[PDB]
Write a protein that binds this DNA or RNA. Structure first.
Ligand SMILES: [K+]
Ligand SMILES: [K+]
Ligand SMILES: [K+]
Ligand SMILES: [K+]
Ligand SMILES: [K+]
Ligand SMILES: [K+]
Ligand SMILES: [K+]
Ligand SMILES: [K+]
Ligand SMILES: [Mg+2]
Ligand SMILES: [Mg+2]
Ligand SMILES: [Mg+2]
Ligand SMILES: [Mg+2]
Ligand SMILES: [Mg+2]
Ligand SMILES: [Mg+2]
Ligand SMILES: [Mg+2]
Ligand SMILES: [Mg+2]
Ligand SMILES: [Mg+2]
Ligand SMILES: [Mg+2]
Ligand SMILES: [Mg+2]
Ligand SMILES: [Mg+2]
Ligand SMILES: [Mg+2]
Lengths: 101, 88, 565, 171, 196, 316, 49, 132
RNA sequence: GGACCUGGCGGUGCUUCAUAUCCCUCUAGAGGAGCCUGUUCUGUAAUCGAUAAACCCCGAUCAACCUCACCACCUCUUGCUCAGCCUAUAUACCGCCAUCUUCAGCAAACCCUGAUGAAGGCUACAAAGUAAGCGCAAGUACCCACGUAAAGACGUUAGGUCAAGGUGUAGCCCAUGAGGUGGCAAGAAAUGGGCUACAUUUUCUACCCCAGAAAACUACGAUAGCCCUUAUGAAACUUAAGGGUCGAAGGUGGAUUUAGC
């Protein structure tokens, strides 16, 4: 019952990124150093690249939680400018007022 | 309750941010919003654990909606036994 | 902080439209709010997945969905203990046979935990959110079947069987089952002996003298098995003796004199069963008076703790005994003992509470000064309890006795706010009292303002099944309150309603109508007075007609009046 | 989703298109005007498809002097309640699709000759219950304006009379 | 027939009553309970402020009707049995740093919501002057080189801030452990300290 | 019609007077005060504690005032039961305004027969309160023309009282600098301390009565602190104007702002503190020279749709 | 979790405790299109083949 | 021209409320806020989770009290507690109100794991500020 | 067709004006060069929308994959959803805006005039207008009374957006839906806006304003190109930073034009 399929894909992406977070962290640690041999680092470069693409956190997109809008989103409220203003223009967001100075 | 208390007002903070006025295009026309945070520091002195416990509970429970609190407690301790003399 | 005397119980919404007016609404407004919490729990346990998510820190175990359905779907000894903690009587008894049929050994601690659930409910399912008369101990019940199957029986086995029979009014069989316990060289516990005294007397309706000998045998066996009695053991004896009102009087005291020696502080219930036994509908009540006085002094200045369920009933009983004795000094002690510590929670349920305050406020009005009686009426009502018609009528008979008839226009406004707007008996005692005697103008004009609000009530009534009916006295009084006040104009519009409903008008209303007409000096109106009385064939009208004729009557009217007769 | 749901007022306001460029200057035909309907008219609080009977809300709280418990209607009994409801709505539609036969005037679509009733009563205890009003002409006059352009206005001519020699007209 | 609302209990209220009993704890503005002709709102041309009945502006306000002076004085009179007396000996602050040279900092945060957690509550700051410690010339010179910028020469105060562990009781024990190893390591003279 | 002007009769306002008096005794029981000596200033203080509102508009906050200060004055019924208007100028529409012009014109005819600073004429908005009648601008001017005409004539004592009613008072704040209190240090030297502000710079200056013209800014000689000559010229300006260079010792401490903002802030501080060691006439010359006024020119904010404060993006 | 919010209020509407004015709207528009002939076809047995 | 939260002028037969009669540039000058929590304060967190609760609570109450809400909700948070304050019409019977109070309080307390209390203030008819 | 009314227009008149404004007048710029960036053409198997003022670093406070809607290939069928659709229509709409607005109008309800035509409605030594309400104004915010924000009615341009979301109507339903893998988003050319420069009021260094050098084919001048390294990331000739190499045009800009008290 999500807004659209685009939102649904991100939900799966974020779920698969939480399961492999530790596995990817442990494998990158080997790569991110000049201590271990290249032979071992070359084997870790193939292991972290064989994991599902949706486990990669760079594919996660911060969409709006009501309208699934990819751009124009405020991270503190996870809302689009259009949905934020609607609630702010009606005095529903504690502390939010229009600025004049 | 017999507690020494001093009151001052720290400078307020105003966080501002801008957003597009229209749903589509019209970039030059934007709307600005702000959040105003006002402070009030109550510096009590020479309390005890029991005295602070009931007083904080009393004021904390009656804290009104939209009002946060940050209680910083400076406790007096004594030097540990090991720090009194070196272990020759 | 104390109680707000101007507000209804906190549980209700503080709003005039949502405030419970009458006592029926009070109880019906809390049952509809409890029905929303049951309709929410229904939905919280039927669809848990919606509410499983937990965002609270620290975790709130009391805001999580319950899971009644069992999980272990296999057939082992540990899968049965999970159906006994969930009180699944049918599943456990059907799943026990399969386990027993297989031949797997069943511990003695697991079969005794099944009898407890069967002997307690009596092979019946407990009440669930959604899916008295007679004996509920069926002869073809699992409790007796599983009992025979068992290969070994310990003390707990019988102990939890005897208590299950007495609970479901199977008294006769429990005594037969107690003889076997004696044949197996066993020893019963206190709880098993408690139910054996209830069954003994209840089993047969014999004379008390025989029963007293019987009960003493169980107590002598209780001391022959190293068994120590508790409070409930004595409480049953007093409760059981209730039937023998007179005879038990002295014996019941003996029970109370053995509870002190062996160190058993009597609770509120122990005293509640003595007063009920002693209390009887007798005019002298000589014995009852002394008993309550001693009991109160002992209890005076004490704080109570729950021990037996009957403890709550004590307060209602004492006030009832105080209203029968018409003693207000003893009602201030009972109500003063309810305020100490947190004893105010023993008053009881809403039904018990209203009865207690009713009998209480009814003894205050009658007996004490009218200045304090109006201070108890402002405190209790409505914060403590909503009054019943008989309490407003009991208050009106105090003002009459205290020559304070100026508060009746305030007692009627309250009645309308407490659901007595359309109470015949209430309106029939307010009008007569106001119209009984003449009062100064300032006070006579106030009573007319209440008769114009009491008159509207008759015109508009909630029940339309029957035609509107006006009592003879009411119409007789509402009209005379207008005349004295000065509202003559409206006093003549009520004349038609007397004959319309065939309501006989009193002579005191006609005699006083002469002055109004004489001051007006309008014979026409005077003839109307004569015409109305003539319709009812009143004797005074014939004599009165002559006097009007002499004073202010037109010549033509005089001839017509005689013919009309 | 559940957060992309509006209210009835917002849904009808957008569906009717009463306020729009088309309405402003005779740009929309009246052949098939859309008509607002209240979907809450015949709805009872607590009545759903499952047929649950909620004490104190859907049904009486107490029955025979005792409080009721949560119950659910049977399929046979709930099927009779849905079909009897549909009658309620089916009625509204066609009833609201009949016509009030106005006594036509000179012509069927002509305003002239139609009665407007008696004039409104005056504030200082004045009434004209004996008078009758009849339309004579209804003209649609237009005027060019600076901003709007061509705005539509109505000119009406009426006559009033009591039937006893008193009569007058106005615009 | 149609239910009729009762008159407000404000009329019943007396002028010489006990207000705390009406508003013992925090509650929203109830016009039927508050016996004041208080108005709110911006008036229209030739108009007056809106009345309290149905006013949504007086419900937004977090009122202090439950915290009237009479109440506070009445509440705190009952809370004097919980408090303890501060040692009279400790008159000023200079005397508190003679018997208690260590000052521990700890912060609690109160925010609205279902969760009370806050990662900022684990930080513990320990301050202690080096003049209150039994240090010599060598120890004091070495202790200032290990702590780096944790020591302020202007105030001769060593500040230890610990946020490593989740709990605040673990960071307090870790700060007391760091003070001990630095004290016992400052007195220990190594063989590589001769090449200074 | 649904919209009707809220009309308040005398009976309604009479019931509001009783609810305020009873509410005034309740509010005193809450706060624990004496009802009798409970003024309106305490009500404003108690309503601001019990009902704390941070609304910028003070007319939108909770208020519990007397009904005569809330409800507006309304034109009372202007006729009896019979229907005859009391006043003889009812049908004019402005019976109060024309009765005043009729009275003023009648006093100007008697004069013929037998024959200032701090005050201003009643403003239009204040003249509609005395008459409870809406007045145009032109009608107000006509009334003022007759009053002035009255003053020119040799008006009697009674007439002066009549005109005085329409003459409101204006409190004019004397444009005089506030002299700082001369203090004395431990050694006994006399000085005066003042503060200045320029842009974002704030300065405190101590001016000793007797000195050798030594200035120390933040503990540094002024020529070292201010290399640019212009900055030094600003420092000299105050003293040169009062022709007393090399006679005082200054010790100032400026914080914030930039090079030129700090000098201006010190100039103003020294100038204000140097007014205590000069005559009143010299202080007025300093004021007329712009040495005691705080420059209100501060940076202007940038607008969301423009390149700058006032500069606009290039028009395509 | 839009599922939980969208499933709870769907169940509460079928139980009668929540009135969704948005579904009613689109329950009536889908009811007026069956009478107008604009009914969704059976899957597989579509206009195309 | 600006449209947000503004009720356009009409002949005069349209009744609007105080909150509905004021535009967004009066939200802190003539109006308050309908929700009051600490999420949006400097250095506070969980502003996006208090917001989602408000959007749902206003819809839950609008569909659970249909036709009974005279004005917008005023949500208040004090620690764990959440206080819903509402103005409602008197058309519905009290019996049904008490049912909805115990159903909504309980359901929302198990859903947001917090003590929820609802305070109704009945009004005869929708308070009218002015007629636009 | 004749004669009027209103409105618009006029290379229509008089008079008075424009304060960053129409023109002249003051200051820095644009168009000239290189780069960055958008658009249009062209191209590609390979989105959409805005597009005179009121489009053009516009939706995007942002595209390596994702975002993504596009293309090619493969796959699924009651399908995350009591389905679904970024499918058409902004000329059905809500919603949010632009614009005139750097305006002062707007208007219900009455009244009167014109013979009761559309229409119209002022003169203060006053001749038919009165007016709630909306706006302006006033209040408020920011450092005041100033100024700047904000606000700014009714209307206009069927202005903008069905691709924020929702939605009326028509249409698709083994496909106009859903998912996966790979991939394109270039530059002959033209144009808009911007950055950096053409230097000596400069360049480099020290300092942060009392200095010493430089200074035209090893000068000024690239944020470009080429090479390497690093950072982020699963993935970088590719994005960004830095270093090295390189040392171009350009030498002050035609017609015209922008902003600012
Ligand atoms: K023209
Ligand atoms: K240029
Ligand atoms: K260029
Ligand atoms: K539009
Ligand atoms: K659409
Ligand atoms: K859309
Ligand atoms: K350029
Ligand atoms: K350079
Ligand atoms: Mg790398
Ligand atoms: Mg704008
Ligand atoms: Mg026809
Ligand atoms: Mg600039
Ligand atoms: Mg493009
Ligand atoms: Mg791809
Ligand atoms: Mg598609
Ligand atoms: Mg459009
Ligand atoms: Mg201003
Ligand atoms: Mg602006
Ligand atoms: Mg303004
Ligand atoms: Mg070079
Ligand atoms: Mg380079």
């Amino acid at each position: 019952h999500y807004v659209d399929w685009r939102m649904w894909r991100d939900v799966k992406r974020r779920k698969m990124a939480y399961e492999y977070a530790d596995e990817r962290l442990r494998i990158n640690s080997l790569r991110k150093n000049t201590i271990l041999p290249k032979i071992l680092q070359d084997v870790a470069d193939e292991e972290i690249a064989a994991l599902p693409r949706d486990s990669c956190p760079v594919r996660i997109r911060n969409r709006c939680v009501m309208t699934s809008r990819p751009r124009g989103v405020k991270r503190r409220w996870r809302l689009s400018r259009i949905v934020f203003r609607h609630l702010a223009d009606h005095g529903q967001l504690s502390g939010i007022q229009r600025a004049t100075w | 309750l017999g507690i020494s208390i001093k009151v001052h007002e720290p400078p307020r903070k105003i966080e501002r941010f801008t957003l597009l006025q229209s749903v589509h295009i019209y970039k030059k026309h934007r709307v600005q919003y702000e959040m105003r945070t006002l402070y009030r520091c109550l510096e009590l002195e020479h309390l005890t654990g029991s005295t602070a416990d009931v007083y904080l509970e009393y004021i904390q429970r009656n804290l009104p909606e939209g009002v946060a609190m940050e209680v910083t407690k400076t406790q007096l301790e004594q030097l540990p036994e090991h720090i009194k003399e070196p272990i020759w | 902080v104390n109680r707000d005397t101007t507000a209804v119980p906190y549980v209700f919404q503080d709003d005039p439209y949502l405030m419970p007016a009458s006592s029926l609404e009070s109880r019906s407004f809390l049952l509809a709010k409890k029905s929303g919490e049951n309709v929410a729990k229904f939905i919280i346990n039927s669809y848990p997945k919606y509410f499983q998510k937990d965002i609270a820190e620290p975790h709130i175990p009391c805001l999580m969905p319950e899971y009644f359905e069992p999980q272990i779907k296999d057939i082992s000894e540990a899968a049965l203990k999970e159906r006994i903690e969930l009180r699944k009587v049918k599943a456990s008894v059907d799943m026990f046979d399969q386990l027993l049929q297989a031949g797997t050994t069943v511990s003695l601690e697991t079969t005794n935990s099944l009898l407890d659930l069967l002997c307690y409910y009596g092979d019946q399912e407990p009440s669930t959110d959604y899916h008295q008369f007679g004996v509920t101990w069926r002869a073809k019940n699992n409790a007796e079947r599983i009992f025979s199957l068992m290969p070994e029986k310990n003390e707990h086995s019988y102990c939890t069987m005897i208590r299950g029979m007495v609970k479901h009014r199977a008294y006769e069989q429990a005594l037969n089952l107690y003889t076997e316990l004696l044949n197996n060289r066993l020893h019963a516990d206190v709880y098993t002996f408690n139910a054996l005294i209830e069954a003994t007397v209840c089993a047969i309706n014999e004379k008390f003298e025989e029963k007293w000998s019987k009960i003493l045998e169980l107590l002598r066996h209780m001391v022959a098995q190293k068994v120590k009695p508790n409070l409930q053991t004595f409480n049953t004896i007093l409760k059981c003796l209730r039937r023998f009102h007179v005879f038990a009087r002295s014996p019941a005291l003996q029970v109370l004199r053995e509870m002190k020696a062996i160190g058993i502080e009597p609770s509120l219930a122990t005293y509640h069963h003595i007063i009920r036994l002693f209390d009887q509908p007798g005019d002298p009540l000589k014995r009852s008076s002394f008993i309550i006085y001693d009991i109160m002094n002992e209890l005076m200045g004490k704080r109570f703790s729950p021990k037996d369920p009957d403890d709550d009933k004590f307060f209602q009983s004492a006030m009832s005994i105080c209203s029968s004795l018409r003693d207000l000094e003893l009602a201030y002690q009972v109500h003063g003992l309810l305020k100490t510590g947190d004893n105010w929670k023993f008053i009881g349920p809403d039904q018990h509470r209203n009865f207690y305050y009713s009998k209480f406020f009814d003894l205050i009005c009658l007996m004490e000064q009218i200045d304090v009686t109006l201070k108890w009426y402002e405190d209790l009502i409505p914060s403590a309890y909503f009054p019943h018609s008989q309490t407003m009528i009991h208050l009106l008979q105090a003002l009459d006795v205290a020559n304070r008839l100026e508060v009746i226009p305030k007692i009627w406004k309250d009645s309308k706010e407490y659901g007595h707007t359309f109470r015949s008996d209430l309106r029939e005692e307010i009008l007569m009292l106001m119209a009984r005697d003449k009062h100064p103008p300032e006070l006579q004009v106030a009573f007319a303002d209440c008769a114009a609000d009491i008159k509207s009530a008759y015109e508009s009534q909630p029940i339309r099944q029957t035609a509107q009916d006006w009592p003879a006295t009411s119409l007789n009084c509402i009209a005379i309150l207008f005349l004295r006040a000065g509202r003559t104009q409206e006093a003549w519009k009520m004349l038609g309603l007397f004959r319309k409903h065939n309501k006989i008008p009193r002579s005191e209303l006609l005699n006083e109508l002469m002055d109004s007409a004489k001051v007006s000096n309008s014979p026409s109106q005077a003839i109307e007075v004569v015409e109305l009385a003539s319709a009812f064939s009143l004797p005074i009208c014939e004599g009165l007609t002559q006097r009007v004729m002499s004073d202010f009557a037109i010549n033509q009217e005089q001839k017509e009046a005689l013919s009309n007769l | 989703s559940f957060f992309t749901k509006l209210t009835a007022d917002e849904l009808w306001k957008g569906a009717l298109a009463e306020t729009g460029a088309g309405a402003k200057k005779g740009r929309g035909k009246r052949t098939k005007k859309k008509k607002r309907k209240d979907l809450n008219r015949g709805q009872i609080i607590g009545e759903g498809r499952y047929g649950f009977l909620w004490p104190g809300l859907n049904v009486p709280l107490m029955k025979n002097g005792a409080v009721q418990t949560i119950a659910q209607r049977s399929k046979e009994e709930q099927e009779k309640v849905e079909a009897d409801m549909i009658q309620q709505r089916e009625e509204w539609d066609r009833k609201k699709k009949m016509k009030v036969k106005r006594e036509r005037g000179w012509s069927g679509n002509s305003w002239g000759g139609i009665s407007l009733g008696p004039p409104d009563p005056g504030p200082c205890g004045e009434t004209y219950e004996d008078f009758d009003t009849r339309i004579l002409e209804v003209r649609n006059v237009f005027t060019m304006t600076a901003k709007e352009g061509r705005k539509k206005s109505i000119r009406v001519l009426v006559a009033v009379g009591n039937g006893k020699g008193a009569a007058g007209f106005s615009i | 027939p149609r239910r009729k609302a009762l008159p407000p209990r404000t009329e019943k209220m007396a002028v010489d009553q006990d207000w705390p009993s009406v508003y013992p704890v925090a509650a929203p503005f109830k016009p039927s309970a508050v016996p004041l002709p208080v108005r709110m709102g911006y008036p229209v041309k030739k108009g007056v402020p809106m009345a309290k009945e149905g006013n949504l502006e007086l419900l937004k306000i977090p009122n202090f009707l439950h915290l009237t002076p009479v109440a506070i004085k009445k509440h705190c009179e009952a809370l004097k049995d919980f408090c303890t007396e501060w040692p009279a000996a400790l008159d000023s602050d200079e005397k508190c740093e003679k018997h208690f040279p260590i000052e521990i900092d700890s912060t609690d945060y109160v925010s609205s919501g279902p969760s009370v957690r806050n990662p900022r509550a684990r930080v513990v700051v320990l301050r202690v002057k080096l003049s209150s410690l039994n240090l010599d010339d060598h120890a004091k010179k070495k202790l200032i080189k290990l702590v780096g910028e944790r020591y302020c020469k202007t105030t001769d105060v060593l500040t230890i801030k610990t946020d490593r562990c989740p709990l605040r009781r673990q960071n307090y024990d870790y700060a007391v452990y760091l003070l001990t190893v630095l004290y016992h390591e400052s007195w220990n003279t190594e063989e590589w300290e001769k090449s200074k | 019609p649904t919209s009707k002007r809220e009309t308040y009769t005398e009976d309604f306002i009479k019931k509001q007077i009783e609810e305020f008096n009873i509410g005034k005794r309740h509010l005193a029981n809450m706060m624990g005060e004496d009802p009798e000596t409970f003024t309106q200033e305490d009500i404003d203080r108690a309503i601001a504690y019990l009902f704390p509102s941070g609304l910028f508009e003070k007319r939108a906050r909770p208020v519990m005032k007397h009904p005569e200060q809330i409800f507006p004055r309304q034109r009372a019924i202007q006729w009896g039961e019979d229907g005859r208007p009391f006043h003889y100028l009812f049908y004019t529409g402005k019976q109060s305004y024309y009765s005043l012009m009729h009275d003023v014109y009648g006093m100007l005819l008697n004069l013929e027969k037998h024959q200032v600073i701090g005050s201003r004429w009643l403003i239009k908005e204040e003249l509609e309160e005395m008459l409870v009648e809406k007045l145009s601008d032109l009608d107000y001017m006509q009334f003022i023309r007759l009053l002035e005409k009255l003053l020119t004539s040799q008006c009697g004592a009674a007439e002066e009282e009549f005109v005085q009613r329409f003459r409101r008072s204006v409190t004019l704040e004397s444009k005089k600098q506030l002299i700082e209190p001369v203090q004395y240090d431990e050694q006994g030297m006399a000085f005066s301390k003042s503060e200045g502000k320029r842009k974002t710079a704030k300065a405190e200056a101590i001016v000793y009565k007797h000195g050798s013209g030594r200035i120390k800014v933040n503990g540094i000689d002024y020529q070292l602190y201010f290399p640019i000559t212009q900055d030094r010229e600003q420092l000299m300006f105050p003293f040169h104007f009062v022709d007393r260079l090399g006679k005082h010792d200054v010790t100032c401490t400026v914080s914030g702002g930039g090079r030129s903002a700090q000098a201006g802030a010190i100039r103003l501080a020294m100038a204000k503190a140097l007014c205590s060691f000069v005559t009143e006439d010299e202080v007025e010359w300093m004021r007329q020279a712009g040495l005691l006024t705080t420059d209100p020119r501060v940076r202007e904010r940038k607008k969301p749709g423009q390149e700058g404060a006032r500069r606009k993006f290039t028009w395509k | 979790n839009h599922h939980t919010y969208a499933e709870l209020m769907q169940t509460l509407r079928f139980l009668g405790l929540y009135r969704d004015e948005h579904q009613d709207f689109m329950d009536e528009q889908k009811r007026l299109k069956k009478l107008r002939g604009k009914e969704k076809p059976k899957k597989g047995e579509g206009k195309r083949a | 021209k600006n449209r947000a939260a503004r009720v356009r002028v009409s002949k005069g037969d349209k009744p609007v409320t105080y909150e509905e009669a004021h535009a967004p540039h009066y939200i802190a000058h003539r109006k308050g806020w309908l929700s009051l929590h600490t999420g949006n304060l400097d250095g506070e967190d969980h502003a996006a989770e208090r917001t989602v609760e408000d959007v749902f609570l206003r819809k839950f109450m609008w569909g659970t009290f249909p036709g009974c809400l005279a004005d917008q909700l005023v949500l208040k948070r004090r620690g764990n507690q959440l206080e819903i304050c509402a103005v409602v019409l008197r058309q519905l019977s009290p019996h049904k109100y008490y049912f909805l109070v115990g159903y909504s309080e309980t359901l929302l307390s198990y859903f947001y794991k917090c003590p929820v209390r609802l305070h109704l203030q009945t009004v005869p008819s929708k308070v009218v500020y002015k007629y636009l």
